[model samples]
Target chain A: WQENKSWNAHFTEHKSQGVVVLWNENKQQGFTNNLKRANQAFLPAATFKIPNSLIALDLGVVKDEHQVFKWDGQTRDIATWNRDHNLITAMKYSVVPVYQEFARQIGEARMSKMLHAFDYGNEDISGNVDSFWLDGGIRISATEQISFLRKLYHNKLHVSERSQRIVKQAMLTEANGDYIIRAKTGYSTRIEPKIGWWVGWVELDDNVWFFAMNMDMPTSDGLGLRQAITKEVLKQEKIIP
Target chain B: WQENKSWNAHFTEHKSQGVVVLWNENKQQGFTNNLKRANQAFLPAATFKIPNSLIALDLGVVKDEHQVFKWDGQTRDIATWNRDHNLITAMKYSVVPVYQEFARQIGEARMSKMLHAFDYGNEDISGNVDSFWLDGGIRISATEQISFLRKLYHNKLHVSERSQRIVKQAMLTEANGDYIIRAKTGYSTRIEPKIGWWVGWVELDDNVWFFAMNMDMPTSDGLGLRQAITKEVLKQEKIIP
Candidate 1:
């Protein structure tokens, strides 16, 4: 739906928001709004796990998708982070510590180098290596997020197919009779209004719709709204229905 | 508000439906759903009067916006049709007899030539000139409706500026504090599952958003649904708010 000659400007009752949905399948089409804000960059938050996983697997930094990250015994805000975790589980749990370790092990120099090689975001890891993507110098817009996913979906990323597949496998969050959705929710309180992002795609056997939505999260309550609003948009477009 | 990455196929359920809104002022932009259907030709019913009004004025067939058509004293099924009507009243009442007369005066030859020049729909005028647009040969799609309106709005049509303004002057259907909506609803039950259309624009001093919505009217009960749904869509898009 939403293909015709009229432009609509809507869903503006909340904080500032931006979204981009690209359909890089058969017809090669796409749509967007708030292009200006969508082009404005922000921290990638937990979403960077995707590229991090890709780089980790490609560079031999991790053994495989099931490789474990042993955790310190100290309890953390997210209880799931207290135990050892494999790639998929850590991603599912959004364990910042694990990804932080990957960023640290990857090191600022190599990580920055790999980021530039991949042409990821700003490709600037000029701050703390461990939290470069968390709230450091790295930043990306909704548009860049989906473009990178488009490349990943088509196996065009520089990383080996296995690395991309492993990352993609780790990212699967949903599956049903007609569609499978792979996405990540990223959150950062580093900014005043906080920020939330739901970035991913819906896959059909022959087509896929990649999307990225970021919003100002006034409260933690808005965390789910990232996925919430995107889900509403997807369903409203009948991508699922 | 519908923009942001997330492939969406939205409009409505049951039969396919489409909507296009093109803002025709300081900037050029718009929105749509179901592009193929948006452009696909369908019979244009009473909405044809919009152009008929323009053609009638341009040719001096009707002296002015207030030119009246005296009822021939034929009792009609639609009660509003039995009275004498000027341009505004005929359009507001959708008195088919009145426009049919204008179409008659404009004649099929001139009508076909003008329709072709305007690039309106199929430009087919193979049937009776008096009722060609009603259960006759003319056809148009939601996309074409707005394109035609966009041209008419900017006085790009071959019709004199006076004719275009005169037609627009008679087409004003609603006005609120911030927006003015000028539209025509067309209902035709010559075929089962009657086709309904609401095509027009919402205007402000600085900008105008032209829109066209088409749907199937299951029964006469759906008569209002065209405007109802269009208004709902406009409000949802905050086009009116």
Candidate 2:
């Protein structure tokens, strides 16, 4: 429950980094880190999109993963973000503006209620609606991250079952033979001391293991390492192989 | 080698964190998270003082453990600064000025050759003589750290036996009837994300275990947790009661 060896190496290089994990299904135990920061809250960054995805789908925000979000043509830093994208692409590429529109459509009142219903971290989206996660209003600890993922893994995130299924399908990163991995990565590098996140689950046979790992990155390039770190832990945990 | 069950928990909080351990006596083995971060270079921070102490002593930079370096009244962050400090007090307080003086006395040419002879890291001390280990080019990985410590443990770091003994004696941190811990911590939080390190070995009856663990600390408070994380693993490994 406590160890994920591969992730630790990537963690040490950065000035600050952390990882936490939870094993589910027949195994009702979990483990990751013990630092108070595991209990302390920080900006959830893009990981919030997990809950955001569920809410969008459940509210019929755009009719399943095929729904489209038009790019505002503001010339974002990521080359992948300059064009219109659908649910899957938005979720996969972590298009912030797409999610900003989702938040706008979901509106503050419903968003607040859904966050309360989901028990998402601090849940204080008081800043610019489009950039709260990036600028530091919604926060979650590593422990809470794993907890939230565990709920999602079990189709119990307080959203409709179809919503969970659709969102989970959109998150599906790979399906090879007997194993499948569904995960999302969130990154906030525009801010100082960049943050990277990988949140999702692994399914094999009847068992599922949910993981949440966040690490400080040296550059915006760190955004790419989030899923790489998490997948490495899955290898260390033997959930993949 | 990888996976020490208990240490993984402490590493999960921050943006990123990591640990590497070597139990080479009865074990003849080690552990470090995957991802070449364990091998990729990073500033050794103050932990470089361990080798710094040995090199200084071998060259007779200071007369012995009692040799003193008077404070320059430059005013540093640590309260332990602001006073005359010797090899013992200097090592204990991690007075940068003291070691900086030793590097000055040892001179770059001699220190460079000695580091080459010792095969320490990349052997690139091209930065300012005194500050490279803190902020510039000198770098080492966790795996390499324990590897070097392994040599130190076997009295094979290419220094004199007595120099090794005195340096080892000076590194002693905590001791009781059952065991003695010889370790030091290095922290460099001046930059954005911050880095904290605890590196050294634990000696018990008939065995020696060395470790290198570092993680992002949200604040200075993370400094204290460095040892706490290492000690937690020592306990789990049954190296400590």
Candidate 3:
């Protein structure tokens, strides 16, 4: 990966200690604002939803996008999680219960093998099967997030193309005449100096630019900075109009 | 197209005077709640934004989705229209002035030729270039909306695939592991017995179900019935869960 400090201003402006890793497909090269932090590992947080979705679909545990997981009537911090959810609504709202159920269905043995096949984040599902990616031993670097995003964009992951396509479609956050932004946001508030992530690809003028950004978010008020800094850098680089 | 009153209960429950047309791609069949009304023509209204966006892009009048049309210093009925917007935001909010400006830029001569090529509705742009679809002679039946949507789904339109792809992306409303719903809503508040329309297709389990529904919306309160009834019918038909 190439260290391009040109994007340092964005993190500085937001008072964030972070790294932004960009992989340009056409040039087959990588760029990062800070190479050191880009390689430092952290919990995958909600960003693990992408691969978890694929593994669930590959195993037929989730059935299909329309498969509804019933809510247990237990209240959660988020209001949207109080009701049943299908894959789309569950992913859109980031409902923890629905996905936790999927992990339980997948079980520990198969999930470990699947992660190994995926070559994901040290292949560590050593702790709780459901919460490992959120707060347990499983961790991945921003550079690794970029690597996974690149593979998914090109349908090069170990899973079938169908599973990959479904997960990719679920990741779609924005699309227009100019560009398509398919991404996932992640936050690990369970740990001090909470980590926030905005990882995705930008499809522009028939080319794909993959990016993974993670920052030290001390409070919820700075949650917006994860996306703001990424977009600002993308705009500055003319990856988006 | 075949007539099937199986969906009539949904409209009856909503107390709406309307018709619904559904085309099943796999079976190569069509069903309608009311065949007579399905053929009855009405103003295209804001639903015309689908074709208008395509024409503007094809003519290079709007460079891309990012081409921002600055809002005039006028307070409109909706709050979103008071500011600038690109094609995506403009279409999302159904901003009248941004599209009106597009019509002005396309002019009557070229737009007439373009619509003729598209075989869109009545191919009429006789009145004011900007308001013809809203208040002029242009009209289309529910069956015709289904036909146009079918062609666009198959990429059979006269416009380039790029423009069709962009327009299709913009129409996405809901998607998940099981189904994808791409649709547009149109309302003609100026006409007597005001008209409301919900038109689009549902992609489910490797098949496409195209639907177009228009109802007599006497007031804004009945506006939501257009979608409420349509989705209810779709669920009854097992097109979506």
Candidate 4:
């Protein structure tokens, strides 16, 4: 309840965008001031890689863990580097080429199905490359992120425990104590400086929580500002608590 | 192109949540990930008043624009009744008694037709109260809310412009410059603290932009939080621009 008060006070004072957080347990506790405004409509970015990795593992698209694809030392563009990397390494490094190849090999149909099974969005994902992959997609409410993470934590998506663990372990930023933090980050070109992201729980020990954050700015340099804001929020919320 | 690049940067940093945002015109140039976890489903609350008012006016359930109903000094709960209230005044004040009476007078058959025409969540209105008047009777998405508001703005939902204007004028929050902002609010008791909603459009220099914002909170106090957040967002995004 106090969290809600503080959240409202902050929202009113800064006019910062709205956010919804959920704690997964027997009794679900959360608050949303704008039901229509909150929901997951953002691109998964590399965070989307979690499911891609699982799909690749399940489809035999890749041989196994530690399997390496050779990267020809080539620069595809200013942003992308050409490389032959394995599933484990690709996820860890968030290599666009590796996942792009995997996306190509898995084909659109398989990729679409994996995304659909997870209820990725309302639109058809058959032949089209999601704009979020390139241009960015629609809005995602903070609440939707938590719900998807809950399903993953419960192993409800039917992916193997080993696969879930592999992806989760690869995504973690810190895990030395009672609180384990696993996350991924994202940004938009329109708002270059601000870092829009999907960084939250893939899994936490007795308690599981998942969240997504987006900060809009005029330039890419604001990445640090975005990170600092989220880090402080997490600290204050004691999400690490 | 730069926008896409910045978004990709954010995506790379937060790879777990698939941070994609698309620039589709239909998507309102926003993100579109499916991850249903973030969405909150709630009763339309007072938001239903907009449709209900339209239905009442079109069906001639109420005597006329000037016809008034007197509120008996009876305590059903928290608030008191107004001595004299007309269809327009009832809606502006969000008087439950007036709407309930109107719904009862419209009868189940006509009421059902109006709701069906609008594709209301529930088709049946046969119970002691309008089904939509009860918990679980109606559910609306933010997308649907926007669609409905557009229809209202276009004057396509009602038979006559005069009738549409009557309700539209009553729904207006206030007059501002050349643009007229018309809106309605809603709340629900089932979900304690209730849901706060605002669905309306701003007609600026003959150009209209219809929008809707809904928030579900644990308590009534949180309604102000949602209202402040949405108001700021509308201003920041230049919805009125």
Candidate 5:
């Protein structure tokens, strides 16, 4: 059974309010109008950390996945959460400084190669490392996100199969009787007053699915609206069961 | 000097004319269309052999640069000239058998990756081996062709530096003054028939400038029309000496 009508009806109520959702692996079904288009190109914020992790792994810059990086807390202008960070921990908690350093190490040229190879939506990779992390760095279409996830699942980008397995495993949220769900949550206050993101892939038996959702509101306080909508959609789609 | 003409001029003079000259890298600046909405995609005819050569080199399925594969006259149909062929000979003669065999060996997946990496105009790569040669199997935009050439110059997309040097060396035409011209020609019979081409840079005195031209005609017999127009454009533009 699927919660097709509930999701459709919820989206229908906000149909005029600008909302879009696609179901099934083929993306043959969806909803939307102008409000959703506003979110179409919203900065991905920390959601881009996934690619950073993949890049780091592939380039051999990170010696051990668990090795910790010490933060100096040198920059006083930006928000700094004082703590030791590791790759997995950085990804899970969305550590800005750690990712900024990672971005610098990855560099623009190699990053451009990886991102373009992923074939994500937008092509902009400008701005500083930290700015890209918090200020809503990259933009990707929903279709593009799904396609990238497919490639990741298929291990097509020269990423080690073990690396793929570990990342996917770490991303899983629930594993129960009939379904398994994995996801990554992201939020930032760099672009609009607030931005939110949920980008990750899900696996159910032989079928693998990927999704990315973003939201921009008039105030930082409304950031929850993005995550709320994502939760509702996933729950409705039985993807969160 | 560049041929800066209005869209109306192109439409009035060329549209529905089956015998229009396609771009000729050896002669003119090639097909000149300044319009943004024009559909310039057509099979590259034998021009597809260029990428075929690239794939063969990159994959290492064929070892020797001078390796030869002979043609065995095996006529599947009397209407079409079919024979067995090899890489260097296939590239030199633009033979269908040689490329088809290479395409088979390279496999669709690897070829798709290289084509996509090179940013070929279209996404799909399913067609007969001689499609780009006879009926114009592959279609590419001039802009896309230029980008592909740049990649070739930079030796990106897994193509070894030696292979890049070799391919560029093979593509070189006679020098005009100090400038060395490297280019490829294509013809097809999809519509009224069309001529296609890629011509451009790989370091001229430390800097690079790349360009591409495509020409379509109203008739199948318009091959000369395609060549003459492109040659004139090239000479006029000083792309060739």
Candidate 6:
């Protein structure tokens, strides 16, 4: 319901054209810093894990949380993905190949249908079924990210409740007696402006708040600001202390 | 995922038997003071407005958000209900007769089908259609409350997205640039122990969190605790500062 300058300090300090948006379910209201760009679409990158995980679990491509995703002999710079991974470990590491395998198993036709069912942004899989979110045509805005996350938080996604619940569990970033943070971080190293994202929700007592933040990552080191800016804004809003 | 003693202080301070449960969509986790009681079912009372409003909009009983409900010239101690109302105003005042008028129009046959479609708790509307949620066998739990609200938030319910959006608009309690709170409060005075309820979600930026709190309102003065205790716990949990 508001577009304000409260969060501009974070973006200014980070020296990026960053945008962050939070939607509160109780009030059905929204707070955002960059209104126009918040609606502007960008590559989802690894943030696609949120929906990809749901579709995988829903279509039975993933038998359950415990099903293992075997690693191929090919090694990527990311060491975590070098070994075998189950759903949770792959999610924690954001293993691209593991999820790419998931996409391959999901198949193009099925993935296409699932995207429409989810009403996921720009639903284009013309790139490659396995890497469309990373290299293909799929794109989503910060606001659209919230819309999708809100449903996942509510367990209302078109997937089975168990599948939705598992994906949410996989998204968990931090947990304690006071609150829990479940989110995913994304980086599109293959593109210009090098998009980065930190999208997820915070749980305080009984309330769940959804958020999405994205910005241009001109330098590899700048990717961290995706979460840094998000946390600073969250702290300023008092979502986390 | 945690059942702890942190919240007992609030209930002790209030001197009432109460329970609170919060589910985080991001973590797919929950925090509860009393897990057993959280699952126990109780009459929805006025909190039923969340669903009833959805049904009203879905079935076209209440028309659009601007359609007016003509005042029946009935006077109650709550003066707000004495005048005509649109959806937002009626929810603001929580005018019982106006909602009863909605239920009457919804009718028993249609109301029964909607409740089942919603998977509402105990779906027994054998009592008068206009008063089932208030005085009949229908009941829901704190956890179930979260399940229902999550779907509504995502606009995934069987009802039209337009209808869900309108009901969410009606449930708004407070809004500003920082966050928004959309919730409904309920009281069942006709029963023993006199149940009181506060059910809804809080949205900050793009994140949406949900909560449901109910307590035995032995006296009318104690009813305020339904919100007071909820706010205090939410504050202690850092949901609101």
lDDT (C-alpha) at residue A214 in model 4: 58
- CA lDDT, every prediction? 0.74, 0.72, 0.84, 0.55, 0.55, 0.81
Model 6 spans > 4 angstroms off: A1-241
Candidate 3 vs candidate 5, DockQ winner: 3
lDDT of 4 by residue, B1-241 (tens): 1122232332233222221212223234432232131133446767777777778777777645557687766655535344467765566667787778877787777877887887664444544565356464556655566666766655677455545656764665644333445677666667453556666665443235555555445556654543454444445446553
lDDT of 1 by residue, A1-241 (tens): 2231111222354444555444556567766655666677889889998999888888788878546678967799888788888787778789888888787778777887778877788888866888867768888887789778988876788878667766875676765445667888898777554788888888653457888878777678767667666766667667876
Off by over 4 Å in 5: A1-20, A26-39, A73-80, A133-137, A224-227, A239-241, B1-241
Candidate 4 docks at the CAPRI level of: incorrect
- The residue-by-residue lDDT of candidate 4 on A1-241, one tens digit each, is 1134354443444435544444545346654434444553554455666666777777776656546777767777633235555564465456766766666777777776776776654424433343335344423445566666666655566666555545553455544224545666555553223335645662332355565555454555655554455545555566654
TM-score of chain A of each: 0.91, 0.87, 0.96, 0.76, 0.76, 0.96
Q: Model 5, chain A: how large is the TM-score?
A: 0.76
lDDT of 2 by residue, B99-183 (tens): 9888888888988988887788887787788888877777777777777777886678888866776677567676544566777
lDDT of 2 by residue, A177-211 (tens): 44656787777666665667777777653356776
* Model 3: pairs clashing at backbone N, Cα or C within 3 Å: A65-B177
Worst 10 residues of 2 chain B by lDDT: B7-16
Which segments of model 4 are wrong by more than 4 Å?
A: A1-5, A8-20, A31-36, A76-84, A126-132, A136-141, A190-195, A202-205, B1-241
- Compute fnat per model: 0.00, 0.00, 0.00, 0.00, 0.00, 0.00
| lDDT (Cα, 0-100) at B173 in candidate 2 | 71
Cα deviation at B221, candidate 4, in Å, is 53
User: What is the per-residue lDDT of model 1 for residues B97-116, given as tens digits with 9 covering 90 to 100?
Assistant: 88888888899789999999
lDDT of 2: 0.72
lDDT of 6 by residue, B50-126 (tens): 88899998888887766788889867888777887878677767888989988999889888998999988888897
